[PDB]
Structures are given as structure tokens and as C-alpha cells.
Amino acid sequence: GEVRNIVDKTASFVARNGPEFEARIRQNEINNPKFNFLNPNDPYHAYYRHKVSEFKEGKAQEPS
Description:
The protein is mostly helical. It has a single domain, classed as Surp module (Arc Repressor Mutant, subunit A), CATH 1.10.10. It is 59% helix and 0% strand. It is built from three helices and no strands. Helix 1 (2-17) crosses helix 3 (45-57). 16% of the residues are buried. This is Splicing factor 3A subunit 1. It is found in: Nucleus; Nucleus speckle. SURP motif repeats lie at residues 6-48. It is classed as rna binding protein.
């Protein structure tokens, strides 16, 4: 699933570099639907929120 993979991967980068990247990425692709997930308007928005914290804790399963 693309949506979960981009969520998981974007969350990973924002988890390492900090939430300062969430803002950058969100505003850098605000019109692009590939990043619509970063806004609360998307259904998986809540899923991504968890991924960030999870990658920071270093417990989640990286993608394949």
C-alpha cells in the first residue's frame, strides 16, 4: 500500500529530523495530493501521528 508506505517513510524522516520537517514537507507539497495525508483532512492522518512517535521510540517495523 502506497499511502501506508509514504506515511511510514515520511514519519521516519520527520521522527529523526523532528516535527520541524512535518511543517516543511506539508507546506512544500500542500497542493500535491501525494502529501495530503499530512493534513487532518485525510483519513490516515491519525495513523501517521502514531508512526512519528513510534519511529522516535525506535520500535516500529521499517518498510520493505
